[PDB]
């Protein structure tokens with residue numbers, strides 16, 4: 001369409017040049033701007049992209065949105081606005097015909113479990129033979145087609161384009177992980193949600209939020225941003241075992257569905273039986289109690305599957321059909337995955353990377369340790385270290401602990417492993433600057449019948465290194481390649 | 491319509507009896523429930539209205555919404571739900587066909603100035619000859635028809651009925667004051683806003699919110715609850731002279747318009763000239779700067795009229811037509827009103843009742859005191875007293891200060907005046923247990939050419955007394971009746 005119609009949506013603007021031109025693309029990355037693109041400049045943590053306006057002109061782009069008039073050829077139209085990214089989200093949703101209004105959208109937020117719940121909703125939808133899309137830490141997925149991305153919640157234009165791709169591919173629904181960063185930073189401006197789901201709130205991301213207070217209020221935006229139109233069928237799904245759910249109630253008018261294991265809720269799990277192969281439980285609901293078989297491991301994953309079932313049920317699918325669909329659901333990549341059970345050791349990978357997520361992981365694996373628990377964990381570079389010794393303490397619930405860096409970036413890897421080491425409660429631990437080296441060591445130390453857990457990365461395919469350069473790395477592959485060498489069964 | 495269709499909007503319910511019945515009314519007050527009403531029970535601060543279910547049955551009501559099965563005749567249908575008031579707002583907006591979707595709705599929140607801004611928007615709309623409604627501290631107004639009410643933001647059912655009355659009366663827009671209580675307590679569930687306006691945030695209501703933190707987050711709900719549909723023409727209007735506006739930006743995607751006098755903003759007031767008769771100023775806007783004449787007194791009222799003009803402009807009315815409409819706008823009742831200027835004293839009433847609102851009032855009146863400033867203020871009963879000595883301090887900017895109770899309820903009136911007295915900085919003050927007696931005294935003490943200010947009630951027609959019984963009381967009438975006696979000019 002033409003720039004003219006797009007910019008009628010912006011009341012405060014100084015327009016320098018014609019808006020008669022056709023527009024088919026928008027971008028906040030200058031490297032992809034061309035004729036027919038709007039390039040929207042912004043000030044990032046690293047660079048100020050106003051500086052690349054001359055590049056997009058060179059590349060054919062005839063329209064930039066800026067916060068200050070730039071030096072450009074006369075024939076490039078400039079639209080000067082007070083808040084360029086705000087305008088970016090308005091222009092994006094407009095250009096792509098409001099993609100989040102065009103399908104059912106589920107949003108999941110919380111400190112741990114976002115990937116698990118969001119992926120479980122997508123997998124249920126697929127099992128029911130409905131087209132579905134997923135966006136989050138594992139990247140972007142339409143039905144069974146995956147690509148990897150840089151964020152859990154990508155910047156507004158990329159994110160909006162991805163919702164449009166899901167609509168164009170014929171998705172009937174889409175599920176998004178909603179990071180607390182994404183919310184605060186405006187990454188989700190324009191994204192209408194139909195169901196908002198909460199997992200839990202425990203200390204994380206305080207290098208960004210400053211306080212627990214601010215962190216929780218950040219996550220409440222998913223709930224309050226549902227809005228106020230009570231003709232719409234929207235729903236909220238809350239964990240009654242987390243005390244922040246009481247606050248979440250208050251920020252939204254839509255009907256709330258609660259789930260719980262430890263505290264009373266509308267939906268509960270009773271009579272729980274655990275195995276490394278999955279769980280069974282009695283699913284108390286307001287309409288009756290039903291036996292559920294789930295392939296996922298542990299109680300934390302029972303909270304998670306409950307959230308996912310309730311989310312899908314809320315939009316009109318019978319509980320009986322959901323419960324049946326859950327039985328042979330595929331593993332969630334990198335989230336409590338038991339690797340090749342033909343190995344003579346239990347080899348398990350998981351993304352847990354805060355003290356609370358580690359306790360849930362260890363709680364789930366521990367009843368099944370027959371001999372020694374060998375536990376590897378990483379601490380992330382350039383993050384709040386306040387609870388890192390505490391991660392170290394929690395790791396020491398294991399018999400043998402390996403400390404590694406995880407995406408150390410420009411931080412000294414020794415600094416991070418030393419920080420974890422501060423909380424260790426026995427002498428049975430060891431630190432490696434190189435995580436691949438650390439995994440090969442956990443295999444070396446492991447006996448037949450031992451349990452080995454690799455925590456904090458799952459199948460994440462890179463280590464962020466100095467310069468913020470991504471280097472290939474795969475806990476699962478490194479661990480398997482080393483476990484076959486040591487145990488056979490290649 | 492029938493209960494059947496209404497309750498399809500509620501997913502979790504236990505229905506005891508038929509829903510075949512016709513429903514034309516909903517109520518959370520048992521005293522108005524009858525045949526065709528839904529009575530929704532709830533637990534209040536005073537009583538639990540579940541107890542009156544037998545009364546509504548006696549009165550003919552055949553449908554109650556409860557949080558627990560009650561003792562009732564068999565032919566009364568009960569719908570048992572986990573959150574009765576949440577369901578009340580859903581049922582109400584449904585029954586009345588979503589009244590807030592049916593007109594343009596402006597919402598105003600902030601510690602001081604809500605009544606001023608909200609009333610100024612209504613008055614502009616009327617001046618432009620458009621049907622308009624107002625709801626807030628001065629009660630409910632359709633065009634020029636007024637009724638008084640008990641709250642600034644009434645409980646959900648009353649509030650929703652009032653929006654419906656405005657729609658039925660043909661209102662093209664409606665403006666609501668949005669109290670921080672109303673937001674937290676769910677009074678505004680279902681109410682779609684098109685424009686959200688912020689005045690300021692300073693200490694108040696902490697007996698309810700506990701912290702400034704929680705108090706500000708409460709008010710952010712108006713902004714975040716606008717939602718995420720960027721096809722809708724919604725706008726946010728923020729005061730750049732208040733540092734909470736920086737936080738408000740972040741909780742909403744809609745375009746933001748800023749106003750300011752002390753700090754840079756998109757809309758500013760320059761070259762300000764003041765009189766007891768009104769102000770003139772240069773109104774800097776993004777489209778040019780225009781001379782404005784306003785009937786309201788002081789700089790705080792210039793922030794207020796700016797917010798109101800920008801709100802009306804945002805929905806498509808030209809600034810030139812608004813600016814012309816503003817010139818002879820009617821006084822806002824109880825908000826910096828200069829009473830009979832034929833009196834030989836300046837007699838002024840105002841609602842200011844926190845330390846910050848008092849400073850703004852005194853700032854506005856002071857340049858015009860020719861002799862002595864005689865200042866009367868009340869402290870409210872059963873409220874946080876932490877800043878009350880500070881109100882006492884601020885009052886003592888006057889030459890002679892009268893301390894009174896304001897709605898003392900069950901609090902000792904001496905306790906409240908004594909608390910104000912704690913902050914007094916000179917010996918020229920006096921305390922009265924009876925506020926009428928106090929006003930008659932301010933007249934006694936006043937000379938020709940003095941300024942008398944009555945603060946904290948405006949034209950509020952009652953004193954809440956022991957038992958929470960309202961007794962008639964009117965600062966304006968009591969003051970005028972006493973000023974005529976003393977000065978003549980009946």
Ligand SMILES: CC(=O)N[C@H]1[C@@H](OP(=O)(O)OP(=O)(O)OC[C@H]2O[C@@H](n3ccc(=O)[nH]c3=O)[C@H](O)[C@@H]2O)O[C@H](CO)[C@@H](O)[C@@H]1O[C@H](C)C(=O)N[C@@H](C)C(=O)N[C@H](CCC(=O)N[C@@H](CCCCN)C(=O)O)C(=O)O
Pocket residue numbers: 028029030031042043044045046047048049052150151152153154155179180181182353380383406407456457460
């Ligand atoms: C600190 C931060 O926010 N930088 C995000 C931000 O960078 P910058 O602001 O530095 O970008 P830069 O300054 O280069 O560019 C600004 C703008 O200029 C543009 N530009 C730039 C260069 C150029 O030549 N041309 C051009 O047009 C560019 O497109 C952008 O529009 O903009 C990028 C693009 O959108 C994101 O990809 C970054 O995200 C990084 C990867 C991140 O790590 N972000 C973290 C903070 C994050 O967002 N986390 C959440 C939650 C996930 C999480 O935090 N997980 C844990 C996991 C820990 C365990 C790991 N196993 C963690 O990482 O701590 C999320 O991903 O949604």
Ligand SMILES: CC(=O)N[C@H]1[C@@H](OP(=O)(O)OP(=O)(O)OC[C@H]2O[C@@H](n3ccc(=O)[nH]c3=O)[C@H](O)[C@@H]2O)O[C@H](CO)[C@@H](O)[C@@H]1O[C@H](C)C(=O)N[C@@H](C)C(=O)N[C@H](CCC(=O)N[C@@H](CCCCN)C(=O)O)C(=O)O
Pocket residue numbers: 518519520521532533534535536537538539542640641642643644645669670671672843870873896897946947950
């Ligand atoms: C503490 C509080 O919230 N009680 C509000 C609340 O009472 P209760 O919970 O005690 O009601 P109660 O317990 O009796 O009844 C519960 C339920 O049972 C029902 N019910 C009751 C009796 C019955 O026989 N049958 C029946 O069906 C009834 O309709 C209700 O649905 O429900 C009423 C009805 O909806 C409101 O009218 C009250 O509001 C009062 C007046 C108030 O003062 N509220 C304050 C806290 C307030 O809301 N303030 C804000 C902001 C304005 C403000 O605070 N201004 C300052 C002004 C100070 C300067 C003054 N010059 C202040 O007052 O401090 C606002 O009004 O939006």
Ligand SMILES: [Cl-]
Pocket residue numbers: 258265266572
């Ligand atoms: Cl509940």
Ligand SMILES: [Cl-]
Pocket residue numbers: 082748755756
């Ligand atoms: Cl601004």
Ligand SMILES: [K+]
Pocket residue numbers: 100101102103104105192193194
């Ligand atoms: K949607």
Ligand SMILES: [K+]
Pocket residue numbers: 590591592593594595682683684
């Ligand atoms: K509206």
Ligand SMILES: [Mg+2]
Pocket residue numbers: 110111112204
């Ligand atoms: Mg997180």
Ligand SMILES: [Mg+2]
Pocket residue numbers: 113114115136137152177
């Ligand atoms: Mg995730």
Ligand SMILES: [Mg+2]
Pocket residue numbers: 600601602694
């Ligand atoms: Mg207030």
Ligand SMILES: [Mg+2]
Pocket residue numbers: 603604605626627642667
């Ligand atoms: Mg008010």
